[PDB]
Enzyme design. Structure first.
Site, PDB file in Angstrom:
ATOM      1  N   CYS A 132     -14.046   2.669   0.103  1.00 11.83           N
ATOM      2  CA  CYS A 132     -14.170   2.926   1.405  1.00 11.83           C
ATOM      3  C   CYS A 132     -12.864   3.093   2.106  1.00 11.83           C
ATOM      4  CB  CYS A 132     -14.946   1.815   1.852  1.00 11.83           C
ATOM      5  SG  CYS A 132     -16.571   1.639   1.403  1.00 11.83           S
ATOM      6  N   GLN A 133     -11.806   2.733   1.755  1.00 14.21           N
ATOM      7  CA  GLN A 133     -10.484   3.054   2.562  1.00 14.21           C
ATOM      8  C   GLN A 133     -10.234   4.438   2.362  1.00 14.21           C
ATOM      9  OE1 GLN A 133      -6.856   1.339   1.328  1.00 14.21           O
ATOM     10  NE2 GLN A 133      -6.270   0.625   3.174  1.00 14.21           N
ATOM     11  N   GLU A 268      -7.299  -3.139  -2.906  1.00 10.72           N
ATOM     12  CA  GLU A 268      -7.110  -4.587  -2.720  1.00 10.72           C
ATOM     13  C   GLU A 268      -8.284  -5.231  -2.225  1.00 10.72           C
ATOM     14  OE1 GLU A 268      -5.487  -2.123  -0.872  1.00 10.72           O
ATOM     15  OE2 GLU A 268      -5.397  -2.786   1.199  1.00 10.72           O
ATOM     16  N   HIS A 292       1.200  -5.713  -5.968  1.00  6.66           N
ATOM     17  CA  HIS A 292       0.954  -4.996  -4.798  1.00  6.66           C
ATOM     18  C   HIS A 292      -0.416  -5.560  -4.325  1.00  6.66           C
ATOM     19  CE1 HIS A 292       1.627  -1.597  -2.176  1.00  6.66           C
ATOM     20  NE2 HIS A 292       0.266  -1.699  -2.156  1.00  6.66           N
ATOM     21  N   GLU A 293      -1.421  -5.331  -5.325  1.00  6.34           N
ATOM     22  CA  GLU A 293      -2.631  -5.639  -4.522  1.00  6.34           C
ATOM     23  C   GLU A 293      -2.919  -7.162  -4.331  1.00  6.34           C
ATOM     24  OE1 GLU A 293      -4.453  -3.049  -3.961  1.00  6.34           O
ATOM     25  OE2 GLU A 293      -3.082  -1.728  -5.178  1.00  6.34           O
ATOM     26  N   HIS A 296      -1.703  -7.820  -0.824  1.00  2.00           N
ATOM     27  CA  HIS A 296      -2.450  -7.453   0.283  1.00  2.00           C
ATOM     28  C   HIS A 296      -3.195  -8.528   0.542  1.00  2.00           C
ATOM     29  CE1 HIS A 296      -1.786  -3.386   1.122  1.00  2.00           C
ATOM     30  NE2 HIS A 296      -1.867  -2.787   0.113  1.00  2.00           N
ATOM     31  N   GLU A 315       1.002  -1.104   4.237  1.00  3.54           N
ATOM     32  CA  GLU A 315       1.748  -0.940   3.020  1.00  3.54           C
ATOM     33  C   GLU A 315       3.475  -1.313   2.991  1.00  3.54           C
ATOM     34  OE1 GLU A 315       0.053  -0.162   0.732  1.00  3.54           O
ATOM     35  OE2 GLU A 315      -1.552  -0.130   2.219  1.00  3.54           O
ATOM     36  N   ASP A 372      -7.304  11.064   4.239  1.00  2.26           N
ATOM     37  CA  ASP A 372      -7.143  11.557   2.924  1.00  2.26           C
ATOM     38  C   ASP A 372      -6.160  12.827   2.887  1.00  2.26           C
ATOM     39  OD1 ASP A 372      -8.680   9.580   1.877  1.00  2.26           O
ATOM     40  OD2 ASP A 372     -10.561  10.675   2.192  1.00  2.26           O
ATOM     41  N   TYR A 380       4.256   3.816   2.800  1.00  2.00           N
ATOM     42  CA  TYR A 380       4.741   2.575   1.620  1.00  2.00           C
ATOM     43  C   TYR A 380       6.150   2.477   1.728  1.00  2.00           C
ATOM     44  CZ  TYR A 380       0.035   2.851  -0.517  1.00  2.00           C
ATOM     45  OH  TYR A 380      -1.149   3.012  -0.830  1.00  2.00           O
TER      46      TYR A 380
HETATM   47  C1  LIG Z   1      -6.544   2.537  -2.297  1.00  4.25           C
HETATM   48  N1  LIG Z   1      -5.555   3.198  -1.579  1.00  4.25           N
HETATM   49  C2  LIG Z   1      -5.756   3.511  -0.023  1.00  4.25           C
HETATM   50  C3  LIG Z   1      -6.702   4.474  -0.005  1.00  4.25           C
HETATM   51  C4  LIG Z   1      -6.707   5.265   1.260  1.00  4.25           C
HETATM   52  O1  LIG Z   1      -6.251   4.707   2.134  1.00  4.25           O
HETATM   53  C5  LIG Z   1      -5.646   5.382   3.327  1.00  4.25           C
HETATM   54  C6  LIG Z   1      -5.134   4.781   4.363  1.00  4.25           C
HETATM   55  C7  LIG Z   1      -4.680   5.412   5.521  1.00  4.25           C
HETATM   56  C8  LIG Z   1      -4.439   6.615   5.450  1.00  4.25           C
HETATM   57  C9  LIG Z   1      -4.073   7.566   6.718  1.00  4.25           C
HETATM   58  C10 LIG Z   1      -2.370   7.539   6.682  1.00  4.25           C
HETATM   59  C11 LIG Z   1      -1.931   8.227   5.955  1.00  4.25           C
HETATM   60  C12 LIG Z   1      -0.282   8.436   5.925  1.00  4.25           C
HETATM   61  C13 LIG Z   1       0.101   7.438   6.964  1.00  4.25           C
HETATM   62  C14 LIG Z   1      -0.696   6.559   7.749  1.00  4.25           C
HETATM   63  C15 LIG Z   1      -1.795   6.559   7.684  1.00  4.25           C
HETATM   64  C16 LIG Z   1      -4.945   7.385   4.441  1.00  4.25           C
HETATM   65  C17 LIG Z   1      -5.796   6.697   3.391  1.00  4.25           C
HETATM   66  C18 LIG Z   1      -4.027   2.403  -1.468  1.00  4.25           C
HETATM   67  C19 LIG Z   1      -4.528   0.807  -1.868  1.00  4.25           C
HETATM   68  C20 LIG Z   1      -3.193  -0.185  -1.954  1.00  4.25           C
HETATM   69  O2  LIG Z   1      -2.126   0.105  -1.086  1.00  4.25           O
HETATM   70  O3  LIG Z   1      -3.157  -1.115  -2.458  1.00  4.25           O
END
Ligand SMILES: CN(CCCOc1ccc(Cc2ccccc2)cc1)CCC(=O)O
Ligand SMILES: [Yb+3]
Ligand SMILES: [Yb+3]
Ligand SMILES: [Yb+3]
Length: 607
Positions: A132-133, A268, A292-293, A296, A315, A372, A380
């Site tokens: 979903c994220q 997470e 990391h997870e 969260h 992040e 995306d 991060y």
């Molecule tokens: C699963 N994954 C995240 C999936 C997608 O999540 C996002 C979350 C936020 C964004 C938009 C964004 C992109 C760059 C900077 C700020 C915001 C795009 C995708 C990483 C999970 C983790 O960090 O453990």
């Protein structure tokens, strides 16, 4: 304002709970059922509200036992379509009602991947998983698809009785389905309020093995033993995380190892972290992803970004806690090694987007941006850099960890913005406000490119990687003979990876050097996904045709975007492989994860 959501905002109304009753139809690749949302008005005389949807088919909406009027707006691209619902009775402030929406998903739901039996390990059963994220929950069910709203949920999921359903919740039993004895209903409860991006579902031929007092590992039968060993540090990591973060409030911490098309390293999801099978290196070497997870469960799941512009809050803090966990287990020198590596990853990202690009800003503006498309290492590592710089500015790790724990306590169960965070930082460090006022906030938070200041890093474990990388880069043909397998003698997998990363930063190297590297180091034999990724990249960028089939195979046999996207981009950039890259993408496209299909598509400029 949440510019990624079309739903009524939290100032208008708030979802308090979801009861999901659905059935998973593998024959039609649909999820069908009812989403009953308990919604609390935040306003006087509220008579309608708006929910996010994307490729949903709405059958009806029921309030107080009767069908009500609703309309779907025009599709706004990646945001989906707004669903306006007319309330039968005007609500006063704080009044709650239950809205039952009957719906069906599209087989193209950007939230879901449906896998045929042949795409699974067992080859006997299909498999379904969600992601979903950031904003794909609206592609499963109608909701206020914004992390500014937190709700509890319960669910009842009917699946073919040979299969198992799991969710981001506590398992609350199973029973035959009264409506169809070829099926089971699995039940779930999540009693901690969560943003809807943390709703998760897997359905498949899953088995579990216990690996700690509060952890089961789940995967198909053929990955269970390998997984249980690979992630055996999990409980020890939870205990350190609890020490740093305060009590773990979620009950269980289970792991699900997904099929190879899972688009990310980890997600997470509360009670049930999803991970890539590309972590199964055999030696626990990629366990930082687990740290990391785990982290969260505090930074992200308890304290949550209010909108996606503030994703770095999620992040940065999670990377910071991650690296402390790995620091506790493996030593402060290693924490520094990983921190410095992360800076190098930040340099890579800034170089890829460009140093003035808006996606290299810490706080991004996602107005009219598909999240995306913006996703990268920046939130991060620029986030982590910021916090690591403040730790050094404010008196060291032990002082700053006091702040991190106080921060989690302060904002638990809330959604917050960068200013909320800065405000509390200043409050907490009031006696160091003069130190804090020397920070260039405008640059760190809002300016593109590398941060204005680079933290200090211990170099001990990094030095040997840089020294070998530099030997290789400065070598001429007559130096190639001096390289030997003994070069790698005292390098951990982590240092081999960093040696490759260093070298990759100056790619291309001469083809003759790369061939010699294979000759003496036999990198082709290494199945660690991080090492193999960077090694194939170095081969393809240095124009070694023999690596073409290796790079194509890695790009397609797993689907972690971190690896699949740059491998395809590199293969496309190399004239010898350009046509195969495009052909391979076109041939796999239909069986790819929908978000990965979309992004590899844009990266290759195909369609
Ligand atoms: C699963 N994954 C995240 C999936 C997608 O999540 C996002 C979350 C936020 C964004 C938009 C964004 C992109 C760059 C900077 C700020 C915001 C795009 C995708 C990483 C999970 C983790 O960090 O453990
Ligand atoms: Yb129960
Ligand atoms: Yb203040
Ligand atoms: Yb020479």
């Amino acid at each position: 304002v949440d510019t990624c959501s079309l739903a009524s905002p939290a100032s208008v109304c708030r979802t308090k709970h979801l009861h999901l009753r659905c059935s998973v139809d593998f024959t039609r690749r649909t999820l069908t059922g009812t989403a009953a949302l308990t919604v609390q008005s935040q306003e006087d005389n509220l008579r309608s509200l708006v929910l996010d949807t994307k490729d949903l088919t709405i059958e009806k909406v029921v309030i107080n036992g009767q069908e009500v009027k609703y309309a779907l707006g025009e599709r706004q691209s990646y945001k989906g379509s707004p669903m306006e619902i007319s309330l039968p009775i005007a609500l006063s402030k704080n009044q709650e009602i239950v809205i039952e929406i009957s719906f069906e998903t599209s087989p193209k739901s950007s939230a879901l991947q449906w896998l045929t039996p042949e795409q699974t390990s067992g080859k006997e059963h299909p498999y379904l998983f969600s992601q979903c994220q950031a904003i794909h929950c609206r592609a499963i069910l109608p909701c206020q698809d914004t992390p500014s709203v937190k709700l509890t949920y319960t669910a009842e999921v009917s699946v073919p009785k040979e299969l198992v359903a799991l969710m981001s919740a506590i398992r609350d039993g199973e029973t035959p389905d009264p409506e169809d004895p070829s099926r089971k209903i699995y039940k779930f409860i999540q009693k901690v309020p969560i943003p809807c991006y943390l709703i998760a579902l897997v359905v498949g031929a899953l088995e579990s093995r216990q690996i700690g007092p509060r952890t089961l590992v789940w995967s198909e039968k053929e990955q269970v033993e390998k997984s249980a060993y690979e992630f055996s540090e999990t409980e020890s990591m939870l205990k350190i995380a609890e020490d740093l973060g305060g009590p773990y409030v979620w009950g269980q911490y289970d792991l699900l190892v997904l099929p190879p098309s899972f688009p990310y390293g980890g997600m997470e999801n509360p009670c049930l972290t999803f991970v890539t099978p590309t972590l199964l290196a055999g030696d626990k070497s990629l366990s930082n992803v687990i740290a990391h997870e785990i982290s969260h469960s505090w930074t992200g799941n308890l304290v949550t970004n209010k909108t996606w512009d503030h994703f770095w809050l999620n992040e940065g803090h999670t990377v910071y806690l991650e690296r402390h966990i790995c620091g506790r287990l493996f030593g402060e020198k290693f924490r520094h090694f990983n921190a410095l590596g992360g800076w190098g990853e930040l340099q890579n990202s800034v170089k890829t987007f460009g140093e003035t690009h808006p996606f290299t800003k810490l706080v991004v503006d996602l107005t009219d941006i598909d999240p995306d498309v913006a996703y990268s290492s920046v939130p991060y590592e620029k986030g982590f850099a910021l916090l690591f710089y403040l730790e050094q500015l404010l008196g060291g790790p032990e002082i700053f960890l006091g702040f991190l724990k106080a921060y989690v306590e302060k904002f638990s169960y809330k959604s917050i913005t960068t200013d909320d965070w800065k405000d509390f930082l200043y409050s907490y460090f009031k006696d160091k406000v003069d130190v804090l006022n020397q920070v260039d906030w405008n640059a760190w938070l809002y300016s593109p490119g590398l941060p204005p200041i680079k933290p200090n890093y211990d170099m001990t474990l990094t030095n040997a990687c840089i020294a070998l990388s530099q030997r290789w880069i400065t070598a001429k043909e007559d130096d190639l003979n001096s390289f030997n397998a003994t070069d790698l003698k005292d390098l951990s997998s982590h240092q081999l990876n960093e040696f490759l990363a260093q070298t990759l930063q100056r790619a291309p190297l001469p083809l003759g050097h790369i061939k010699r590297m294979q000759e003496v180091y036999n990198f082709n034999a290494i199945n660690n996904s991080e090492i193999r990724f960077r090694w194939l990249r170095l081969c393809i960028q240095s124009k070694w045709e023999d690596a073409i089939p290796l790079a194509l195979k890695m790009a397609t046999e797993q689907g972690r975007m971190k690896f699949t996207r740059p491998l395809f981009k590199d293969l496309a950039a190399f004239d010898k492989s350009h046509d195969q890259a495009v052909r391979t993408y076109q041939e796999h496209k239909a069986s790819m994860h929908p978000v990965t299909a979309m992004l590899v598509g844009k990266d290759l400029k195909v369609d």
